[PDB]
Amino acid sequence: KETAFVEVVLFETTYTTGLTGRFSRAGATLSAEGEIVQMHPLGLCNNNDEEDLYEYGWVGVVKLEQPELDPKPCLTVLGKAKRAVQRGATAVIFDVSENPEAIDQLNQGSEDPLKRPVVYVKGADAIKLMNIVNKQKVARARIQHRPPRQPTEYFDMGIFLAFFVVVSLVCLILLVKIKLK
Amino acid sequence: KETAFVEVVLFETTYTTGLTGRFSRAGATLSAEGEIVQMHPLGLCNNNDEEDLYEYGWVGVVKLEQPELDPKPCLTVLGKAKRAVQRGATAVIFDVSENPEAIDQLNQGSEDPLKRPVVYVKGADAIKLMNIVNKQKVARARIQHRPPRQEYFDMGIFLAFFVVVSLVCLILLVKIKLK
Amino acid sequence: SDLHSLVIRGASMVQQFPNLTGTVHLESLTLTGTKISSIPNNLCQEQKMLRTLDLSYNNIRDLPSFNGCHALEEISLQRNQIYQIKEGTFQGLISLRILDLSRNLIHEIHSRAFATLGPITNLDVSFNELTSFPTEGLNGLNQLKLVGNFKLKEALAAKDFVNLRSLSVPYAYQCCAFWGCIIIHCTPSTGAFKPCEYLLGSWMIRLTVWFIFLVALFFNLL
Amino acid sequence: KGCLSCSKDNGCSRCQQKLFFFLRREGMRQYGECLHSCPSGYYGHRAPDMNRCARCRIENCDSCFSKDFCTKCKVGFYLHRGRCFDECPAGFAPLDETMEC
Amino acid sequence: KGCLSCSKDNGCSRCQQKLFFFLRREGMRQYGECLHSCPSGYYGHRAPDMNRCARCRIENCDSCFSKDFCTKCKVGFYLHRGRCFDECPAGFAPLDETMEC
Ligand SMILES: CC(C)CCC[C@@H](C)[C@H]1CC[C@H]2[C@@H]3CC=C4C[C@@H](O)CC[C@]4(C)[C@H]3CC[C@]12C
Ligand SMILES: CC(C)CCC[C@@H](C)[C@H]1CC[C@H]2[C@@H]3CC=C4C[C@@H](O)CC[C@]4(C)[C@H]3CC[C@]12C
């Protein structure tokens, strides 16, 4: 559940613009890439037995609306992601900047893991993504697992030596009381 | 020499088959994903004036031929990969199972790194990849590198040398008492 | 003669399989919230083109032979009371993708029970508390989870499973011995406390504890 | 716009009580707005909560009435009851110069 | 068919002596097959090294001779010298009974 430095590509020449977002526990965190295809919160329903199909592979952008606007949503937020993966998506970018409660909706979905990554982009950083999905005709989204490099097994190596120094030094002051006796 | 985790997907329910390869020190090692587009080694030349263009984003598979077969190759192996990225590719997968010298051809050219990953798949693993590019009509390839853990092997040196440091001092204490 | 679907669910009073002596063109047959204990053996004699077969919440004692009917795609037999699986249950059965048997009373799976099926992509045999698990012909599945099988202690062979990607074994000692990460994701993660190669881990720390026990007793007797 | 909410990036999310709700996606963005009638090749489907303008599935149909009944068929097929047939059975007018049967 | 290498994955990767080398793409695989003449919509290009059958860039052409000399234009146009013109100028008939300006 680390950050996700999602970057979009605007080809014809290739201009790249990146932005940061947070992974979610709804699906396993991996790296995926595909054409960015916006969906609608009400378009990811299940009662529609016949829906238009897309090509396999597409990073879907879902702009979440206010939870109080609709009296009864058809499916849960973590259900929309599972429906979208069935449509042939590889990743979903839930713009949760308007429904803050949706973050907890995804984070409680640890009971049933999903095979594909799910990302939520909040704050004013999602405005940049929305402007890209609005202005440019075609773009390409690109998300990568653990975008930074965290020296998890490298930064703590020398901490043990400092831990041992205290053990080696606390015994020396004990000799002072030995000499005073 | 870092391992590459490449798998293919088949839209219909999506069966997934994976295989392993080695990254190369010619393009920045990072994950990428796209459709498999086989490219003939001779089709990636530069003297051509105009050629048909593909949609942006495609993992190209290039099966190298024997070096002695081509006396005057149009471009170097690194040149092939650089041309494909300009063409619109996102991750070029080679097949050096027939031209072993290409690994040196790539790892030597470390002066100008490429923006996108370059992978070479050798041995009998490329046979399975070719049996997929030969049979299936549409495939979907993702390449990834996620090495986790190592986190106790790193602190092992710190823990081990510490005990030697502690014991060598005790040795001298016993030595000096009897003398 | 034109019916395609038949989805009965919640029929919590019927205790007999429905009469289908004239419907031979359905695609999916579903009897979920039921109480059905005897699937008729003469099933593949008709319904020769179904591509789904769901009978989950209804106490089923045993299973018939699905001899033929090579258009069947998915099966699901959960919450049943299937004590045993014979070898002739899945003769042929090409293009069968998903097969669930979770939460039943399975204790013995015949060895020659998965050698004839087609390219199964998923196969879930969970919470059954069996003892042995044949792996003959399971060399194509991408996900196989056995979680509630604490009675099963045997270590699965990794030679049979080649393209497997998701594996959930009862104990975290089969996943580690499976040598995953080809990359394989295992739900019962072994973490760090449960090793597979060396109990002490690295060779450095082993050289340290080798000194401890060597001296903690040689001087102690003195 | 037609509806009331109509967020400036997502379209008109929740429509009114007597208008339809059609998801128009062009390029990448997909948004919807209230419509009085299904535009073309769609069939209105009213509901007590949200009127959905769904998509037709009967082939060779340019304008439908339900999920199975076609109103105006394609320019190459004539219609007999609700379908778009290429063969006109006996006892009926062949085409009447108006693409019917 | 008939070449020197003819590997099972790239097709035949070296023409014989005087034949054209053409890259046939279908589905995903792009196997190189060697031909006597450019099939259609291509123009042969001899060379002392390798005979490449290249693609025409001249507009509205079904069979060409050089990079910019169409031999048989599209049915909707007429050819004056090498190009495919819709308008036929003076001095020559608009069709000459053979789709030729
Ligand atoms: C952080 C680590 C590396 C520090 C290690 C400190 C070591 C070198 C120090 C800590 C305590 C020290 C001992 C303290 C007291 C005595 C008793 C004296 O009669 C002889 C020296 C002797 C035996 C010292 C030898 C050096 C010693 C063992
Ligand atoms: C850092 C840890 C692991 C080291 C463990 C051993 C330590 C505790 C040992 C190593 C050397 C030891 C010293 C060796 C010799 C003497 C001199 C004696 O007149 C008083 C005790 C004293 C001063 C010892 C105190 C304990 C001591 C410092």
Q: What is the 3-state secondary structure (H, E, C) of B133-144?
A: HHHCCCCEEEEE
* Chain B residues 53-72 with a CB less than 8 Å from chain E: 63, 65, 69, 72
Alpha helix positions (H), A72-121: 77-86, 102-107
CA distance C7 to A49: 15
Give the number of the atom of ligand 1 that is nearest the alpha carbon of residue A171.
11
**Residue B177, φ and ψ in degrees, nearest 5:** -70, -45
Ligand 2 pocket test, pick from A171, A175, A177, A181 with the greatest ligand atom count within 8 Å of Cβ, gives A171
CA of C205 to the centre of ligand 2 (A): 22
Choose from B5, B30, B31, B136 for mutation: most chain A CBs within 10 A. B31
Method: cryo-EM
CA distance D3 to C152: 60
CA distance E10 to E32: 6
Tell me whether chains B and E touch (3+ CB pairs under 8 A). Answer: yes
Burial class (CB in 10 A: 0-12, 13-18, 19+), B8: buried
Q: Which amino acid is at B143?
A: I
Structure tokens at E64: 């060409």
Contact B160 C205 (CB under 8 A): yes
DSSP tag of D100: B
CA distance E98 to E77: 11
Ligand 2 pocket test, pick from B166, B168, B177 with the greatest ligand atom count within 8 Å of Cβ, gives B166
- Breaks in chain D (C to N > 2.5 A) come right after none
Cβ atoms of residues A6 and A119 within 8 Å:
yes
Alpha helix positions (H), chain C: 172-177, 203-218
CA distance C55 to C26: 15
Contact D10 A70 (CB under 8 A): no
Tell me whether chains D and C touch (3+ CB pairs under 8 A). Answer: no
CB count within 10 Å of CB B136 equals: 17
CA distance E64 to E42: 7
CA distance B14 to C95: 13
CA distance B65 to B81: 15
DSSP code per residue over E58-98: STTEEEEEETTEEEEE-TTSB-SSSS-BSS--TTS-SSTTT
CA distance A103 to A122: 10
- Is B14 within 8 Å of chain A by CB? yes
Chain A CB contacts of D9 under 8 Å are: 63, 130, 134
**Could you tell me which residues come within 8 angstroms of residue A140 by beta carbon, excluding any fewer than 6 positions away?**
A8, A9, A11, A33, A34, A35, A36, B56, B57
Beta bridge partners of B38: B61
Burial class (CB in 10 A: 0-12, 13-18, 19+), C78: buried
- Is D71 within 8 Å of chain A by CB? no
Residue carrying structure tokens 């996900």: C143
**Atom 10 of ligand 1 has which residue's CA nearest to it?**
A168
Beta bridge partners of A58: A35
CA distance C130 to B82: 56
DSSP code per residue over B122-135: -TTHHHHHHHHHHH
- Breaks in chain A (C to N > 2.5 A) come right after 12
A88 to chain D nearest CA, in Å?
A: 16
Helix/strand/coil for B105? helix
Chain E CB contacts of B38 under 8 Å are: 28-30
DSSP tag of D17: S
Nearest to A40 among D31, D49, D57 (CB): D31
**Which ligand has the nearest atom to the CA of A174?**
2
Contact B140 A57 (CB under 8 A): yes
Helix/strand/coil for A19? strand
CA distance A33 to A57: 8
Nearest to C182 among B18, B146, B148 (CB): B18
Choose from A16, A157, A165 for mutation: most chain B CBs within 10 A. A157
Helix/strand/coil for C133? coil
**Residue A115, φ and ψ in degrees, nearest 5:** -70, -20
Which residue of chain A has the CA closest to D23? A43
Burial class (CB in 10 A: 0-12, 13-18, 19+), C113: middle
Nearest in space to B148 (alpha carbons), one of A119, A33, A150: A150
- Output the CA–CA distances (angstroms, integers) from residue D69 to B39, D7, D43, D87, in the order listed: 48, 35, 10, 18
B52 to chain E nearest CA, in Å?
A: 9
Cβ atoms of residues B107 and B118 within 8 Å:
no
| Strands D42-45 vs D30-35: parallel, antiparallel or unpaired | unpaired
Q: How far apart are the first and last CA of chain B?
A: 57
- Output the CA–CA distances (angstroms, integers) from residue A21 to A94, A95, B17, C102, D10, in the order listed: 10, 10, 30, 37, 20
Q: Chains with 3 or more CB pairs closer than 8 angstroms to B?
A: A, C, E
CA distance A127 to B143: 30
CA of B169 to the centre of ligand 1 (A): 7
Lining ligand 1 with CB less than 6 A are A 164-165, 168, 172; B 165, 169, 173
Choose from A9, A40, A138 for mutation: most chain D CBs within 10 A. A40
List the Cα angle C123/C128/C133 in 5-degree steps.
60
DSSP tag of C55: -
Chain D CB contacts of A40 under 8 Å are: 10-11, 23, 30-32
Cβ atoms of residues E71 and E64 within 8 Å:
yes
Provide the resolution (angstroms): 3.4
Burial class (CB in 10 A: 0-12, 13-18, 19+), B20: middle
List the Cα angle C79/C84/C85 in 5-degree steps.
100
Residue carrying structure tokens 């429905």: C18
